[PDB]
């Protein structure tokens, strides 16, 4: 009977201008991808072709690139309003600059609703933030009515800096009542939209009752049926199918990340509001699809401050930052000692009153350190000087590990010494010792970490059966450089912020840095 098509994006992570196939930065215009203008083009074509359409976003279009560091959420709102977004949910990176950084730019200028149904305010923050986000919405699509409902992750307090007067409940219990009410409102078509992950999406399609479709994200998952057109390996079919406990078929969808793809799911309903048929596949925005000038002009005029700002002073140094290759891959090098300090300074959250902070450790490999920095230019540091050290557009990732995978990593890092290999590890919050005269696999003799279950920080030994939360780059978590143990024996993974921004905020705060070689690594 009734038909609608659904267009969704997720986890753009500030890839606002056109990008490469690895979604880092593209220099050959003839083989490039993504962008917001190309997306405008495709969206407008589909909108003219079809009468019933929905464009949705599932959160996390804030951390990444250099547009967020400078403007801080204004570009998001501007170009979302330009594209005619029909709704939006809240992710975990919308709270990076705090709620005060959320409310003004996004929540007040946006012309479209923002949703979450497990987020509740207590105390003085109840008056301020009431009326600005909603648990659910009703929209007239075509000649019918469509009900929406939102949800958001529960680990946001440990993955961002929201506050202490915002609560994050369980998804299912906070979701069911609104569905029930919506049904009592004579509304029979329901869509869930949220930023929680894939597995929880699956559970919401089994435990919750009344949900016709589930749109989601936060896991960076690829769903294709057929033959993939590019590098990404699909984890499943496109309209994923799950048998609900109430005897129904409920799809699930997710369009990878950045802007490399788009979603396109067509549905067929009946007179009562039940899903009959579902088919589609994600779109790939190659150069075959042209751009839209009225957007590129606006982008080009907004890009000036980006270049004006990359030649400016952030801070100062009085020492030589040896980001060389004969040092950072053979011994301890003070650039890493600077880098992990910033990494931790970023991961400072809340005092549970039984711990001073949940994570107290760093790991970093020497292959991610390209160039040095010399202090003989008035003692000045610039964004370019940093981009020349970390030229990959990576991220610093929070994970969990046992106490044995870590020893495996520290033993693999030193099993072939003397070849300028990028497997040497710079550390933070760790005291380690080596003895290179022993057989490979048994070269680590001492290893000490930093107490968290403790009011006074102190260095304690390692227990080969305990969970430790650690920070390390995405290149390592996905198994780069021979670190398969990490990708095989981890117990969770959450993405983080851009590296250059981390270091940038560290340096703009200290305002003068004199890092030193201390003895976090030594040989006996």
């Amino acid at each position, epitope marked *: 009977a009734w038909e609608l098509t659904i267009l969704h994006t997720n986890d753009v992570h500030s890839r606002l201008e056109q990008t490469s196939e690895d979604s880092s930065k593209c220099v050959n215009a003839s083989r490039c991808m993504g962008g917001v203008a190309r997306l405008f083009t495709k969206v407008q074509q589909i909108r003219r072709a079809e009468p019933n359409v929905l464009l949705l976003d599932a959160g996390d279009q804030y951390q990444g690139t250099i547009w967020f560091t400078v403007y801080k959420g204004a570009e998001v709102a501007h170009f979302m309003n330009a594209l005619r977004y029909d709704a939006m949910a809240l992710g975990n990176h919308e709270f990076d600059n705090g709620v005060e950084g959320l409310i003004e730019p996004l929540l007040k200028e946006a012309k479209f609703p923002i949703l979450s149904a497990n987020i*509740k305010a*207590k105390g003085p923050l109840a008056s301020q933030i009431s009326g600005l986000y909603l648990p659910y919405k009703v929209l007239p699509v075509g000649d019918e009515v469509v009900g929406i409902v939102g949800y958001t992750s529960k680990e946001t307090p440990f993955l961002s800096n929201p*506050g202490t007067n915002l609560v*994050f409940e369980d998804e299912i219990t906070a979701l069911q*009542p609104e569905v029930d009410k919506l049904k009592t409102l004579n509304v029979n078509k329901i869509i869930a939209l949220g930023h929680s992950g894939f597995e929880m999406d699956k559970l919401i399609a089994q435990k919750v009752r009344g949900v016709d479709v589930v749109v989601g994200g936060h896991s960076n998952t690829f769903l294709y049926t057929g033959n993939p057109p590019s590098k990404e390996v699909p984890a499943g079919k496109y309209p994923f199918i799950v048998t609900s406990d109430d005897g129904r078929k409920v799809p699930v969808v997710q369009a990878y990340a950045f802007g490399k793809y788009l979603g396109y799911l067509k549905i067929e309903f009946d007179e009562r509001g039940n899903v009959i048929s579902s088919h589609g596949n994600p779109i790939l925005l190659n150069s075959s699809i042209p751009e839209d000038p009225s957007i590129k002009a606006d982008i080009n005029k907004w890009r000036i401050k980006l270049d004006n700002y990359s030649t400016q002073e952030l801070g100062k140094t009085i020492v030589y930052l040896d980001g060389s290759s004969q040092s950072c891959r053979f011994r301890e090098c003070n650039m890493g000692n600077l880098i992990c300090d910033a990494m931790i300074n970023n991961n400072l959250r809340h005092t549970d*009153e*039984m711990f001073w902070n949940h994570v107290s450790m760093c790991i970093l490999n020497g292959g991610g350190i390209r160039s040095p920095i010399d202090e003989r230019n008035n003692g000045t540091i610039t964004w370019e000087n940093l981009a020349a050290v970390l030229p990959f557009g990576g991220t610093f990732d929070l994970v969990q590990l046992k106490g044995s995978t870590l020893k495996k990593a520290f033993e693999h890092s030193v099993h072939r010494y003397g070849q300028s290999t990028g497997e040497f590890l710079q550390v933070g919050g760790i005291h380690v010792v080596y003895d290179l005269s022993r057989k490979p696999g048994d070269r680590v003799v001492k290893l000490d970490v930093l107490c968290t279950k403790c009011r006074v920080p102190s260095y304690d030994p390692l227990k080969m059966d305990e969970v430790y939360k650690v920070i390390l780059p995405n290149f390592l978590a996905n198994g780069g450089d021979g670190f398969q143990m990490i990708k095989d024996e981890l117990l969770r993974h959450d993405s983080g912020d851009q590296d250059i921004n981390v270091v940038s905020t560290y340096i703009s705060k200290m305002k003068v840095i004199y890092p030193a070689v201390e003895g976090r690594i030594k040989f006996s």
Partner: antibody
Amino acid sequence: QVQLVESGGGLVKPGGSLRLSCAASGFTFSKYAMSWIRQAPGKGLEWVAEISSGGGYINYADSVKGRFTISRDNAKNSLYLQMNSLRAEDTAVYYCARAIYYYGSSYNYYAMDYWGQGTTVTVS
Amino acid sequence: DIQMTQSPSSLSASVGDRVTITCRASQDVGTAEAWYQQKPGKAPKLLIYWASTRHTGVPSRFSGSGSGTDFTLTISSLQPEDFATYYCQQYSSYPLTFGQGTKL
């Protein structure tokens, strides 16, 4: 399965001191904030004092601020209250209510889900 | 916040009718507010917090509404076991005040 039983209530002369105690069993006592609520004779409810999950943050009302003292002992799973300058206005029942759980945020600004029977304290 | 006037004081009802109770705050409680029920000489019990959620174990005829400074508890088709005193709270400020009361 949660039960809170109060004890330690009787008759006192204006100026005396009494110590009430709240038992607890049926859950993990080292995770929840707790409060003391008193109901006057045939009147409305009113809030007295509170304590965090580890005795670190203790906050008081205006009346008992300077005469009462809340504390907890997680080892024995019990709560204690100490009243020193008992006036004639402290005549009422006293309830021992638990507090909602907040996953990652603070414990302040809560609502009470599990209450207790209550004790009578008369100061004449 | 501080005041929490529970406007109704005594309503006459019988099994079957539809009863409504209001609780007008003073400055702005936002959406943090709860509803309690105390029988004659027994410990109170929580029904609704967050101004719309229902505590585990409450009958479905109980439902809350309202936001800002005007709330409401509604019971449809009163039952024999539902003649007690109902109280309204607020946890937006920190004297944590209650409501005077209402007998049903």
